């Protein structure tokens, strides 16, 4: 037990979590093939499609660690989608062949979920992306009505030839109740939304849900861009989802929609043994409760999906997905990075400490067997910023390593106001 | 050697851990057996079920594949909830069955094919409309089943057991027309008379509009899962689906699994019958109405259930904390492939399930400790499992072997 | 350290101080052995004074609960005791059923004819047995509806009995088939006339009642009719034993009917005339499979004068919480004074900890090679998780030590067919 | 060197916490000059009487025996008392000729209706609170609230028009048509409150249902002019036995609860009488409804000389009736405790009773060691032989494990006498 373990040195390590020096770990994870790095430590190739969760408070260095991972991944020639706040990564790594999705950036592609519909089963599939899962069981009940209204109205507008978001928005939120009812006639939603006060209530509810989710889909520049098509296009570049932060709350549902689209879509890609696709989520708890994320993290190995998500508050993720599902979600990331919580959040520091784990050891007093936290909650609360604990999936020791704020030159403007 | 902690002088009580080899030696029996991570399964443990708990990528599919394989080598019949037809492509024989609305080789089916007696109506309505997540959601499901069983019962009477017609009436016909159709059935007056009754009907329509879709588009036929179970030949059943269509087929796939679960309870007394039920992921299905009884009352029918579980937290979400516990407790044998290090709560849970032991070491010292620390589970290499069979048997840390199986058929064939 | 050797799975000790004492099966049999004729629990004679304080048999599936209950019932029959048995698949009926015994199973040729009408003696019996037909709601709201259902039930049935037509078919028609309006008219003249009319709330209440009754009454309607009265049967000294059977593929459908019968028994014994020598057993295979009974609790608490002895199996304490709710489920379990632990599954460490705790700890002094005082579980949760099947921990009420004893699968020949299609 | 009363290891010195003493030693300590009542043979400190006693124990542990002994010794002292007496057991043993009986189905019962307790105008809500006890849930209590409004206004009017009939009250509140009731209510405070919107109609409907559940037994109750308030004030009044045959417990639950609550509110109005001593025996606290006045009676009845003794078989059941918070406050209102032990099937309760008994800090030989431990382990409570109790009086008194004696009492009267 060396100067890597912050506690008392020991004679022998019995069981539990082993802690090693940053150098030792880099030595251990170093592999023949080209690798991406996590805080200077090469990531085991087999760990990539098992995902990485970067947990740490504000200012701890999450964006720095994600920037480095994206970079080294780019150096290896990997394709990737990046939920990029303020277009930071777009400005540093954006190539000419790359895509931009941002309703207010002039360089943005034109799109509407209509562009992702291939089969009839895709209507509900993407209605689930446009209208994410409700926060509460009741909110999800409403969302359920909203999706019905959405998929039926949209399916019809597509049939009559005018797949216009402006139209869809008019019918679902502007047309009088009765006119809407009439428009619905002939669709699976005709009768379901009529006959009782309950049915009328369900319709009213659906209207309200769509009135909240659709707005930005409307104002979003039209085009033929298809995320599904883009994913299949080998020569497709990388996708940068950007937005100015003063408009985060407004774009929350559109951005969530795009992330979810990617998540469901990869499950439809043709068997491609060599494909490697990254999905960078700056902050997992800032998006809405996504419907397909969980499955993408569990079933996207065949598609070569590699998800890297930052999380500033485990508590916020519980608020968004609910406690049970938030745990299942976090449990779907096999590799972890702890940047530490704030000393104002002892509950999170304990969680991170627990996550890192205990070790059983023998020390010279004869000999004493002692179980202890490899990293105490207090050590985490006092972690200097830009310092991280790296715990890759499987039987690997953890290591306290420092993050380096590499400098990257602006290869492109982060934002270009759309006219 | 096998115990990760400090070696000891004497074992007193609790969980005994043993080497993989020693366990194989202990579990080894005369009769032909199936294997769990290479460990022969005690014959008596088969009908007491096995729960394979482990995070993503820990090797659950591999373990279930081995188990199924060895059970096949023994000539055992089985039903397999098979995602992407992986097991169908490897073990599907020519006499075997396929249930998949989008696969050309699928059998035709509608729950109507399972009705023999009058009580079967509610029995299978429970399959088509699984238990609600919440008490309120189950209240609506309850109305949905009423509307379903009464509508379906009448169609069967007039001679038109059409899934298409069922769907029409339950969700397309106008409120008033449906009302008229229901006249003469037990649901006539129950759905009329007050706002509350109208609300109930509306709720029913919505439930059925969510559950029935895939039953309607399902290629129709005369195939009966009950008749299948009785048929000594029958073959094996592979319930497949392409994963990009999982969420849409969730209710139909759940319906089939539940149909099996209730149906075995009606099978004629058959002492040597052996039937396996492989569920890739228990928490991905809806809250099944008959699983629990099937796990508790299926010994006489020879039902052997093997279910994977990636998140205990997710099962709680689907069944509720109380009922999920009862459900997990219904499996007598356990396998732990370990949680992620991002889920310390689950590692603690598996550690606790593995158990403590009281031991003497060193003026000797008496100590109680976990045979397997939560931290040992979080650092478990993938394809490594802890096998804890039912009864008084020690546990063992054994490696899983990725056996290679050649494709003896195509996983999916579009219709 | 010449103590704890053999019985106690932990380290042998010098002196026992306080807490739970564990003894060998042989020694317990020695200690509970009594002069009078006794029934046995896993081969251990049950203290006579413990009989009317009830027994809870807790254990996961396959642990041997049925074997234990079978043994207890058998030894009780050898002593000539009367008993009611909730008998799944008529297993006990097939082995212990005699000619003078009764059967209640709507689909068995041998069943007696019955309807709750047969139990009405006084005016207060209408609500009393309405509580049996319509068990307590799972939730507060569900119970509110059941409440409206009992109101609709007792008033409708009361009138049918008055006009001379006590028909379950007529009762079912009015309560769930007749139109809202006709029902209202039928109710005119009854206590339910105006309670179900006048506002949307009242209409909603009526609608709710209809639904409850639509769920509960079915099997009562199809139940072969007759004049058999469980109350009269209990009072009949020469009455035999009652077997409540059903084929398991029909358990769910029969749940409310069977629950009704069990509850009828529980309320009725409280009305039995004082008979100091009366001994009546109630065997419940699985307590959590029945509905939330309205009278079980009082029967477990106030039935000693009637000579009521209840033996209930329980596979999941969690399932019981789900049926009765956590508070009431605890109170219910606490109503049984003697306990048997057949051990949970290793997949359920929470129940094993529960069972371990229930068995209790002991404080003991041990030689360190200078004495050490230590508190510990007599039985570790892990010991319960590794308990071989057909093994039980018997803990009788009062100051009795516990013992780890094996269950013997005694063989009984079929003295009658389990089920006879009707 | 710690002695035979503490079940654990003997110790050198006692430092702090709960002291356990032998039964004999405690009797010696609590023994007083004045005449006393006994708890499991232990004389009860006179100052502990008006601070109440809670007898906690599973079924068959001996609660009824203990309460019977207490009542008996209280009678020997000439104390007046109200007894919630199941099956008339105590009535049959201690019932004198001058005593009162309240039981709708016993021929010896007095005639009564809550109308008999109304003196002032504020008594209408006061006793409506007795007839319609607190709701189990916040919503149930909202309905109960509407029920009390309907009850007090309807009853107030019937009293005015001269026909204070329970049958009339019941007709209007649950039989008359919605509209007729509305008309009857015109002119009362409830006229407009129950009209004007769907919400108002819903409230009225709710009230009807509540009353339909609570009033039945009040209607069938033999009428008479007996007043519990007047009885309490009557010096020469005897004792009151509230009896019922157990097969009718559920049906009588609301009526019996009403009577118990009537007593609880009523003593708060009794004239200042320094020498008054009145006992209230409740066989099982959690079997009654959620009483509205019990709490105040336990807290403000010392001036009236109220002494409450209540049995409690399940603390969990009391939580169910009163709610966890209020149930705790209620139990905390009893200053003296008796533990007869839980069942071994209820380790949670045994831990509760163990904790209640408390720990002690002690010094033992084994250099000396300071140790904190439970005076009574949860396991000792689970193995407690029946008819054995731990007595812990209020204040700074040690506890003691004492056995209960099943004294025999001869039937001085029939327990029940079929009405009519």
């Amino acid at each position: 037990g060396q100067g890597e373990f912050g506690g008392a040195p020991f004679k022998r390590f019995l069981r539990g979590t082993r802690i090693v020096s940053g150098g030792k770990l880099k030595r251990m994870t170093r592999e023949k093939a080209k690798q991406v790095t996590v805080a200077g430590v090469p990531m085991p190739r087999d760990a990539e499609p098992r995902h990485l969760l970067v947990n740490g408070a504000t200012g701890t260095g999450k964006s720095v660690l994600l920037r480095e991972l994206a970079y080294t991944g780019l150096l290896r020639g990997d394709r990737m989608v990046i939920v990029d706040p303020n277009g930071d990564m777009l400005s540093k790594f954006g190539r000419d062949k790359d895509i931009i999705l941002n309703p207010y950036d002039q360089r943005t592609k034109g799109w509407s979920f209509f562009n992702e519909i291939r089969n009839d089963y895709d209507w509900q599939r993407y209605a689930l992306s446009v209208v994410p899962r409700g926060k509460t069981d009741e909110a999800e009940e409403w969302a359920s009505y909203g999706r019905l209204l959405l998929r039926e109205t949209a399916k019809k507008l597509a049939l009559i030839g005018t797949p216009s978001m402006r139209e869809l928005f008019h019918w679902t939120t502007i047309a009088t109740f009765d006119d809407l009812r009439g428009f619905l006639e002939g669709t699976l939603a005709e009768s379901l939304f009529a006959g009782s006060n309950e049915a009328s209530k369900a319709l009213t509810s659906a209207r309200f849900v769509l009135s909240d989710k659709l707005p930005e889909h409307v104002t979003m520049p039209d085009g033929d861009f298809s995320i599904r098509s883009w994913l299949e296009d080998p020569n497709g570049g990388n996708l940068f989802i950007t937005w100015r932060e003063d408009m985060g709350p407004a774009l929350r549902p559109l951005i969530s929609a795009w992330v979810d689209v990617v998540c469901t879509s990869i499950l439809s890609l043709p068997e491609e043994p060599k494909r490697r696709l990254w999905l960078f989520i700056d902050e997992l708890a800032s998006l809405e409760k996504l419907a397909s994320l969980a499955d993408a993290l569990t079933k996207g190995r065949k598609a070569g999906l590699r998800v890297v998500a930052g999380l500033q508050s485990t508590s916020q993720l519980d608020d968004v997905y609910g406690v049970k599902e938030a745990q299942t979600l976090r449990a779907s990331f096999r590799s972890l990075v702890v940047l530490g919580g704030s000393r104002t959040d002892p509950k999170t520091n304990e969680d991170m400490s627990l996550s890192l784990g205990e070790h059983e050891v023998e020390r010279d007093r004869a000999l004493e067997r002692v179980r202890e936290r490899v990293v105490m909650p207090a050590e985490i609360a006092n972690l200097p910023d830009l310092t991280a604990y790296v715990g890759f999936a499987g039987n690997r020791p953890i290591a306290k390593v420092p993050l380096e704020i590499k400098q990257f030159a602006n290869r492109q403007p982060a934002f270009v106001e759309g006219t």
Side-chain angles (χ1 to χ4, degrees), chain A residues 113-114 149-155 157 162-174 210 214:
Chain A
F113 74 99
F114 278 108
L149 176 59
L150 177 61
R151 83 178 87 86
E152 285 321 302
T153 299
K155 194 190 304 178
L157 288 174
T162 61
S164 157
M165 286 306 299
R166 191 180 178 63
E167 270 299 74
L168 179 52
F169 184 84
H170 172 73
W171 279 123
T172 68
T173 79
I174 304 288
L210 268 24
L214 294 181

Side-chain angles (χ1 to χ4, degrees), chain A residues 323-371:
Chain A
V323 176
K324 297 302 176 185
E325 194 164 342
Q327 188 196 330
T328 301
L329 188 59
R330 288 185 288 98
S332 295
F333 289 85
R334 299 302 307 291
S335 293
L336 166 79
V337 170
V338 171
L339 272 44
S342 181
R343 69 209 310 146
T344 53
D345 194 3
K347 186 179 178 178
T348 286
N349 289 319
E350 165 62 24
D351 184 9
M352 295 170 148
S353 165
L354 211 214
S355 294
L356 267 17
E358 299 195 313
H359 70 194
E360 189 161 58
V361 144
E362 297 189 316
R363 247 192 299 272
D364 287 345
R365 236 148 184 168
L367 281 188
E368 65 162 6
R369 244 121 300 181
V370 173
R371 265 172 38 223

Side-chain angles (χ1 to χ4, degrees), chain A residues 46-68:
Chain A
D46 41 283
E48 285 166 38
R50 284 185 300 179
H51 321 302
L52 181 73
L53 183 65
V54 183
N55 194 194
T58 318
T60 54
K62 293 190 297 292
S63 64
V64 166
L65 194 163
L66 263 64
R67 180 115 43 57
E68 157 180 353

Side-chain angles (χ1 to χ4, degrees), chain A residues 100-109 219-221 242-244 247 413-419:
Chain A
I100 290 177
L101 275 186
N102 180 337
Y104 302 77
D105 188 295
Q106 199 180 62
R107 296 166 292 179
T108 190
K109 282 286 181 176
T219 73
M220 227 270 145
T242 65
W243 74 87
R244 243 305 309 162
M247 302 225 300
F415 181 67
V416 173
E417 255 303 308
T419 59

Side-chain angles (χ1 to χ4, degrees), chain A residues 277-296:
Chain A
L277 205 215
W278 295 79
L279 208 210
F280 283 88
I281 305 178
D282 64 301
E283 169 61 34
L284 194 55
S286 286
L287 305 170
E288 299 215 6
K289 182 171 178 171
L290 309 179
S292 320
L293 216 199
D295 291 312

Side-chain angles (χ1 to χ4, degrees), chain A residues 5 35 61 64 74 77 118 127 154 158 162 170 177 193 205 211 254 263 269 271 293 309 321 343 348 362 393 400:
Chain A
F5 172 55
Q35 294 170 285
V64 166
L74 289 174
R118 304 288 191 64
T162 61
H170 172 73
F177 220 57
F193 278 127
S205 292
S211 106
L254 212 200
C263 288
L269 295 181
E271 312 90 295
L293 216 199
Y321 289 76
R343 69 209 310 146
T348 286
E362 297 189 316
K400 183 182 176 183

Side-chain angles (χ1 to χ4, degrees), chain A residues 46-294:
Chain A
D46 41 283
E48 285 166 38
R50 284 185 300 179
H51 321 302
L52 181 73
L53 183 65
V54 183
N55 194 194
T58 318
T60 54
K62 293 190 297 292
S63 64
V64 166
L65 194 163
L66 263 64
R67 180 115 43 57
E68 157 180 353
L69 242 174
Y71 174 56
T72 60
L74 289 174
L75 296 180
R76 189 173 69 185
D78 292 56
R79 293 188 66 195
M80 48 200 232
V81 179
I82 299 176
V83 186
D84 187 35
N86 305 301
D88 164 50
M89 282 216 239
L90 166 65
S91 78
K92 307 290 177 52
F93 313 123
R95 304 170 303 180
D96 207 279
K97 56 175 302 186
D98 298 324
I99 311 308
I100 290 177
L101 275 186
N102 180 337
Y104 302 77
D105 188 295
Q106 199 180 62
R107 296 166 292 179
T108 190
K109 282 286 181 176
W111 174 95
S112 90
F113 74 99
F114 278 108
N115 302 346
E116 316 297 344
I117 313 300
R118 304 288 191 64
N119 304 293
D120 193 73
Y121 328 84
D122 291 325
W123 289 111
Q124 165 63 344
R125 190 175 179 191
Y126 294 105
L128 241 16
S129 296
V130 179
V131 188
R133 298 304 192 187
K135 182 177 178 179
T136 71
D137 276 342
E138 176 165 60
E140 170 58 17
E141 181 198 350
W142 302 334
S144 178
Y145 296 144
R147 301 194 194 96
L148 169 67
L149 176 59
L150 177 61
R151 83 178 87 86
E152 285 321 302
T153 299
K155 194 190 304 178
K156 192 183 175 178
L157 288 174
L159 264 192
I160 72 174
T162 61
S164 157
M165 286 306 299
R166 191 180 178 63
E167 270 299 74
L168 179 52
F169 184 84
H170 172 73
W171 279 123
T172 68
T173 79
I174 304 288
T176 64
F177 220 57
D178 309 11
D179 289 310
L180 207 193
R181 284 277 187 62
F183 182 72
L184 289 174
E185 283 173 47
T187 63
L188 296 176
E190 181 183 357
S191 292
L192 292 179
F193 278 127
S196 66
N197 291 315
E198 181 65 6
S200 288
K201 175 179 173 178
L203 217 206
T204 290
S205 292
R207 296 261 268 190
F208 276 125
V209 176
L210 268 24
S211 106
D212 293 318
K213 311 304 177 185
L214 294 181
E216 292 312 307
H217 287 258
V218 179
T219 73
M220 227 270 145
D222 282 289
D224 86 318
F225 180 65
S226 171
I227 296 180
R228 302 187 64 174
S229 309
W230 176 79
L231 289 162
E232 298 173 293
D233 182 2
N235 311 304
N238 300 318
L239 204 185
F240 293 81
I241 303 172
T242 65
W243 74 87
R244 243 305 309 162
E245 270 174 352
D246 58 345
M247 302 225 300
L251 295 164
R252 187 184 192 222
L254 212 200
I255 299 172
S256 299
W258 287 330
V259 173
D260 195 81
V261 167
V262 173
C263 288
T264 332
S265 298
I266 67 157
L267 268 43
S268 285
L269 295 181
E271 312 90 295
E272 202 48 281
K274 299 183 46 176
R275 185 165 46 230
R276 263 172 309 167
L277 205 215
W278 295 79
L279 208 210
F280 283 88
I281 305 178
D282 64 301
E283 169 61 34
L284 194 55
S286 286
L287 305 170
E288 299 215 6
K289 182 171 178 171
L290 309 179
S292 320
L293 216 199

